[PDB]
Amino acid sequence: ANMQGGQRLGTNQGKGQSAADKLALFLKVFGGEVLTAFARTSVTTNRHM
Amino acid sequence: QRQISSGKSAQFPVIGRTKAAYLQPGESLDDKRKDIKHTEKTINIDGLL
Amino acid sequence: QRQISSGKSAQFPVIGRTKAAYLQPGESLDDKRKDIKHTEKTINIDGLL
């Protein structure tokens, strides 16, 4: 069935830590691109003096 | 479909526009400033499929 | 419109699809593996018309 003694890098373990989260020790990284608000276009520039 | 390496999750930041204002002669720009809002978007990676 | 020679019938095998599952760490692929199903479709010829 399930493997015995498998290496668990994510589990926090520790003396006082809960270790309930299986992904605790892993940390998030920056995504590829920063999200920016959509550009707003000017309409009146060529419509008056 | 962006790609990352060695990450439990990926974070995407957003930027939130700004507003302009008039500066009278003798007024400091430091007295009227608002800043641009920031927050994050999280896409956490699932298990192995 | 197939053509056969020296046969009382012709059989056409079929292949089904498969599904995907998430493999948690410490879980073997053998326990949750489901085989792709198989069966046949047979077209037996009749006598002389």
| Three-class HEC string of chain C | CCCCCCCCEEEEEEECCCCCCCECCCCCCCCCCCCCCEEEEEEECCCCC
Is the CB of residue C40 less than 8 Å from the CB of residue C13?
Answer: yes
d(CA C31, CA C29): 6
d(CA C49, CA C43): 16
Q: Does C16 touch chain A (CB under 8 A)?
A: no
The residue among C18, C22, C28 with the most chain B CBs within 10 A of its CB, best to mutate, is C22
Resolution in A: 3.2
Is the CB of residue B44 less than 8 Å from the CB of residue B9?
Answer: yes
d(CA A10, CA A27): 10
Pairing of strands C9-15, C38-44: antiparallel
> Looking at beta carbons, which residues of chain B come within 8 Å of A28?
7-11, 42, 44
For residue C34, which of C8, C9, C16 has the smallest C-alpha distance? C16
Q: Provide the residue type at B48 as one letter.
A: L
Tokens for B34, please give them.
């608002």
Query: For chain C, what is the radius of gyration of the CA atoms?
Result: 20
Residues listed for chain A: 49
For residue A4, give Cα distances in angstroms to B39, C26, C27, C29. Answer: 42, 8, 10, 15
Q: Where are the beta strands (DSSP E) in C1-49?
A: 9-15, 38-44
For residue B12, which of B4, B20, B21 has the smallest C-alpha distance? B4
Elucidation method: cryo-EM
Q: Does C31 touch chain A (CB under 8 A)?
A: yes
* B26, HSE (Cβ side, Cα atoms, 13 Å): 0
Is the CB of residue A25 less than 8 Å from the CB of residue A18?
Answer: no
> Alpha-carbon dihedral of residues A16, A22, A26, A29, nearest 10 degrees?
-130
Residue C11, beta-bridge partner list = C42
The residue among A22, A35, A40 with the most chain B CBs within 10 A of its CB, best to mutate, is A35
Distance (Å) from the alpha carbon of C25 to chain B's nearest alpha carbon? 9
Distance (Å) from the alpha carbon of B26 to chain A's nearest alpha carbon? 31
d(CA B43, CA B6): 14
